């Protein structure tokens, strides 16, 4: 979780309040990163991630 939040901060200037992780049935890890209330996750997904 610490590495994931540091990588998110280094890559996208994303600040997270908490990060939950699981390991999927296919063997890759999935992380839910909840952002700080000041920033907008929809805005981040539209601009930085291109997830529209």
């Amino acid at each position: 979780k610490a590495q994931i939040k540091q990588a998110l901060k280094k890559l996208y200037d994303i600040d997270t309040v908490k990060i939950n992780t699981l390991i999927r049935p296919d063997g890759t890890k999935k992380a839910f990163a909840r952002l700080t209330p000041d920033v907008d996750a929809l805005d981040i997904a539209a601009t930085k991630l291109g997830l529209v």
Binding site: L11, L49, G50, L51
Partner: protein, 122 residues
């Protein structure tokens, strides 16, 4: 774009190579998101970015090892990865000088009575 040739890489220094590597990693990271968001001809670009990253890392490692070999040129003890590999038995083999050492009595006998060149008439 996205294809970096080794010929221009071999003339750069460490700082420029690291800076180029940082750019290539950044564009590959964004391009993976663009891949999972939509399909296009940019899969070629991600492939060339991967190969360019491999090229830059190879050039950096080669320049570092050349500098280290120059540094350790005139030293008794070398790092194990810079020592020659050969095989384990070849490394354990007696050196040529030690294998060719002879005793003083043998040296005297070889000095005064070596194997002569000769022919026999018929």
């Amino acid at each position: 774009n996205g294809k970096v040739k080794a010929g221009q890489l071999w003339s750069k220094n460490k700082e420029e190579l690291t800076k180029i590597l940082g750019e290539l990693k950044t564009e590959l990271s964004q391009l993976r998101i663009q891949k999972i968001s939509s399909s296009g001809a940019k899969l070629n670009k991600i492939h060339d970015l991967r190969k360019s990253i491999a090229r830059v890392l190879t050039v950096i490692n080669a320049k570092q090892r050349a500098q280290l070999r120059l540094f350790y040129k005139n030293k008794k003890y070398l790092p194990l990865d810079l020592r020659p590999k050969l095989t384990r038995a070849l490394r354990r083999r007696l050196s040529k000088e030690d294998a060719s050492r002879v005793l003083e009595k043998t040296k005297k006998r070889l000095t005064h009575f070596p194997q002569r060149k000769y022919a026999v008439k018929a």
